[PDB]
Amino acid sequence: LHNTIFSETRKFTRESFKEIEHLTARLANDSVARHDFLFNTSIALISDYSGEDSNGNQLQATITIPNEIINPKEYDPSDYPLAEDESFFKQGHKYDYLVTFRAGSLTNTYEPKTKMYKLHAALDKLMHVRQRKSRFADLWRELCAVIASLDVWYQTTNYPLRTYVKLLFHRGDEFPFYESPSQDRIIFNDKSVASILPTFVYTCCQVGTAIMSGILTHVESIVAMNHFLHCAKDSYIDEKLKIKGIGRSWYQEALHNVGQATVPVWSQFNEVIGHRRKSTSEPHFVSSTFISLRAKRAELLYPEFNAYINRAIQLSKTQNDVANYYAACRAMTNDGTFLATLTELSLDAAVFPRIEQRLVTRPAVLMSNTRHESLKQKYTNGVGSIAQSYLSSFTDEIAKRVNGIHHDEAWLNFLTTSIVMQAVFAREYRTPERIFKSLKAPIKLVERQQSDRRQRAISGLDNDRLFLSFMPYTIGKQIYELNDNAAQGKQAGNAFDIGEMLYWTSQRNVLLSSIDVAGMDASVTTNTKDIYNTFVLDVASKCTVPRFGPYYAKNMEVFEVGKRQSQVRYVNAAWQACALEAADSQTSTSYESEIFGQVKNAEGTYPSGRADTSTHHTVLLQGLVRGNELKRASDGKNSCLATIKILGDDIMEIFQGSESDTYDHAMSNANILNESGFATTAELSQNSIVLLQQLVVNGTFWGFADRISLWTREDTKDIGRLNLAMMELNALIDDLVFRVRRPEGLKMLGFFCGAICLRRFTLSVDNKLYDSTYNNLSKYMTLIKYDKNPDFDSTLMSLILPLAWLFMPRGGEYPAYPFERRDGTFTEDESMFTARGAYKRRLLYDVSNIREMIQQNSMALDDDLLHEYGFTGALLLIDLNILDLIDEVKKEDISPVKVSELATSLEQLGKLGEREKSRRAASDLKIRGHALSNDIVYGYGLQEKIQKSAMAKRVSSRLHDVIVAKTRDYKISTIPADALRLHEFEVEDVTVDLLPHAKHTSYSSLAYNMSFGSDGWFAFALLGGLDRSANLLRLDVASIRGNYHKFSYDDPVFKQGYKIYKSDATLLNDFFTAISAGPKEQGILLRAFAYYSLYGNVEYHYVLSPRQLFFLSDNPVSAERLVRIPPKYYVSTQCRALYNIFSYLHILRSIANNWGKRLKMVLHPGLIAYVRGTSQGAILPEA
RNA sequence: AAAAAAAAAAAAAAAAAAAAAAAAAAAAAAAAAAAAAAAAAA
RNA sequence: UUUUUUUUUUUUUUUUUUUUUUUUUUUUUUUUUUUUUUUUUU
Hints:
1183 residues, alpha+beta, RNA-directed RNA polymerase lambda-3, 4 domains, three-stranded mixed beta sheet, 48 helices, RNA-binding, RNA-directed RNA polymerase activity, viral rna replication, transferase
């Protein structure tokens, strides 16, 4: 495989392509040929080696595998101990994850129904099951995808990673272990093999993605694996989590030693204006921690990797150097993984309450109940008054808003989400009997698995426990309207997300402190709530609501501090609720297991997965920091601040002024976060913003490529649906575009992800018909015969896809390689910037040689070519509806990862009246006879993400008749709208004059694709910038619809909108309320109905993922100056911007073959005839 | 006068694809009741 | 034979996967007719 006609050419031809298809067939299907392919006895085992650093400095690394992985210690059950009473694991057990040991040393010698037997059963579950995490298929097919891509890329197997695969995973003539989705277990064959290797499969996969991606060279892979195997001496993850923090904080060393390095000057609006040369030297108070990190990286690290870090300090010249060595040192200490074990194993050191620093003191309680509870309470000092001197100013404004809402509706609506539900609300919620079942309701512990960090405990949803805390959220969320402090904002996905981070990194006199606060769950004690409780109460005293069920506004007896007797004062409903909510607070997350029964936690554990909890932590943090600004302003010291953003786990703070007025204020904010009880590490620098999966230094973007996990699902549940899987893959590759230093490797790697991983598709055919479907399908397709089983109604027969399916318009939508026409002229290689959608239908025409299509003046496709490569078969498999459907509720989850989880937290309980409004809307449509599919309605949604989160293909006669129908002669069907794709571009001899920001981004690259003279940088020089305007438009669409859905006639939204329009036009208002249609959305649809009825279905449709173009322009006006259109086309056609869309999508489509020359436009005459008969705004309903 | 072939246009019955909606079939999941087997105190 | 666990047989309600049947909805298309023109023979 390392050779081929392909791997030495990289094009697709008659020979090369079909060889790739036929060969990946056996690298996928066969469970033998994979054992050869990986484990072949002809490879040179590497002893020493000489590679390069990621920047080209030549290192020399050696492959050393420890014996403890080769000959593991036997199982010594002092690793996981128990308490004497065996109520729960012993405190301070060093191992919260799997310890290495022999696979067959752990067995059950014990009778059922004991605590030991359930230990060995639960750990026996832990290594065999919880170590099974994979996306597409068997983990060995994943190693074959990565490793195959490595071979084809480097045209050899000389490289080290394969020798790790051979030394580690080949101990015998078979695979040491495999995984069966029937049992959902990793079944060991060799019982002398180590226990933790099935994770090192996924680890070798991730490292391989680092090599193909371009981050880690081969030597860097050797140091990576050496580090891993060294951390696997005792416990893999357990000994990583010590390192992962310290292994990366260095670059501030490197950035300190770089001295003067240039940088692009950002602007607030997301332009790039100048480029300045600034000193990167860290100030004194930052340079003092350098000694501590020096001493600390010695005592803890693997020696070779430590020497590689010191090497990354000494030998880094410019800033780009620090970025590269940081992507390396980040890929070495960290993997695409999901850290997981038995929840009760990691429960303590994660969610168990932690108390340190200084305690918190009570506010003096001025107003009380007859129960001696708290009504009004106010602080002596310090921290309470520090927060209240800020937060307590919003109460005046928040009273007006909380009074306006009708809070009986604020609950009813939420019950109807997740009439006759009112009578449910009352029977139930009108009695004070409700708060009994509330107070006595246990709280389930729901853990969520994180990529690079430990299991995160999340507080769960409905009902009653949230029903206690609903009101103080109804008051508490109002501050989001009144502040820039917290960020709940819309996620665009573009660089517009990061724009202001870049802005403040490029300003002068800046001190950037990004605090990692993530311990807010177990670091918030019981008294640390009162900082928020005084706020919510002091708002509720102003708030007047007559009833929030079951609370009546009524005269209640109160005791003040200065008054001995009881007094009569009118007490509202929200004031009573907020009196009990603080007056009764019990947070115990009790995980019920099979081992220990029902475990429990003490209180002061307040995990933030919800609107209540997140809006608690954000209000606390705001009050603390801004109130501290007011405190410094009250002591006369000038308060230095610019912006403060509370992200999900991270606080942003930005300063100006001298080092004393910045610094002293920074230390003051740190000291007041410590006096509130939180022990956090503030990260202070002239230039950096650390956060998570966003690293912003000097106005560049270093963003983390490891946080994306290519090979591992979080749910571990395999899904045999091919379309959905390839959507996962395409979306991840869209996430890694600007996070990967060389994202050509993503295209090969992802390609063999498509070929090797997702290929075979099992389907049962009713036994009266077997060889018939095998005939019709096996003409084009390639199947696997079976023997009809002993009297089953339907017997399984698999289907291995034609490899050409990955490139097809409705099939896999992927950045295709260049094919070969009959002219010997290859097509254009796609650069990762391409349109997934009806635009991919052009390839059928590129293979037909569109230039002759225009020279012959004909409409046609070659089924000779396309049949020879296998496009016709793939289009059978697409047209036969054989594959597995996808909703838009699944596309509601796109799976890019978000900067701030805060949005995902608040939108659980957010927008109740809206989702209820669209609910009653769509239900009214359903009552009137025209219904809507559950994908389209803005109401519902999130429900299978919420309501059904808490709960527990056959070939029939019809399919046979359809197959018989289409499979005699397929003859790929030509939709007349395809005339739009018959344009093609001549290459002129002039040159394009680049935009000014080319030179600004020419020195220190923005992201890892922006390096000088590279696809990202050059395409950026040609187009390269966002529209803040247009992005604000699509955001104005976003939070309303919940997402930005770029319109097209193929969307079921438009379809079921047109059914209504055509049939009953009086329901369009109800329909628009059901889909949450904003004003311009309504306008666009009402234009698309007229255009769609007049002209039929006519559009030129494409999809550019907002993550796919992170810095690049979505607006296709930037291609005007790039191409030229001969005046012939100006004469006849009245249309313009469509041609700018062709030129746009094409220029993004190549940028590799593009050396900077300008292009022309050649239009097929049938294209002109097709355009001049259809209005421009019909093809493009948006503009 | 004739009819037919060929070119193209207009109209017309019918299979199919897909959203929603109804009935049946199958198979699996969760609970219950009636015949029997082993049993721990009597 | 009174107190407790499982299993098999039979029965019910509900749930899900797929199949089949029926309709409205929205498009693709054998076949028939009429019309503008060329061709042929008595």
